[PDB]
């Protein structure tokens, strides 16, 4: 629930490992991301070690911190479409 609320304000969350148990973190041509340069919301559960994005380095191998988009390609926010019909409604 806290993930999906974060996804609909379009901030790219990043789920990885914290102590092997997948705590959420925030994550704001292909230039690869590796390190924990991004903003980190939990307190002491940080990996303090080799993070990576687990997308294309291999299928299933690299250390986990994967970013999840709300929408794959973003063109217009749907908080505008919900304003678009609600006045007509």
């Amino acid at each position: 629930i806290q993930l999906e609320s974060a996804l609909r304000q379009n901030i790219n969350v990043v789920v990885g490992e914290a102590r092997n148990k997948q705590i959420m973190i925030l994550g704001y041509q292909k230039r690869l991301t590796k390190e924990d340069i991004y903003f980190i919301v939990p307190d002491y559960l940080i990996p303090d070690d080799c993070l990576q994005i687990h997308k294309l380095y291999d299928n299933c191998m690299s250390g986990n911190f994967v970013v999840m988009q709300n929408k794959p390609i973003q063109y217009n926010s749907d908080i505008e479409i919900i304003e678009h019909y609600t006045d007509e409604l």
């Binding site: 080799c50 990576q52 380095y57 291999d58 299933c60 191998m61 690299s62 250390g63």
Partner: peptide
């Protein structure tokens, strides 16, 4: 079986640390 996974995890750990100081 378990080793096959840890051996894969450590090779990516070597590869993502070699590229931090690589000529590549």
């Amino acid at each position: 079986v378990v080793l096959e996974q840890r051996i894969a995890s450590l090779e990516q750990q070597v590869t993502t640390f070699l590229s931090s100081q690589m000529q590549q």
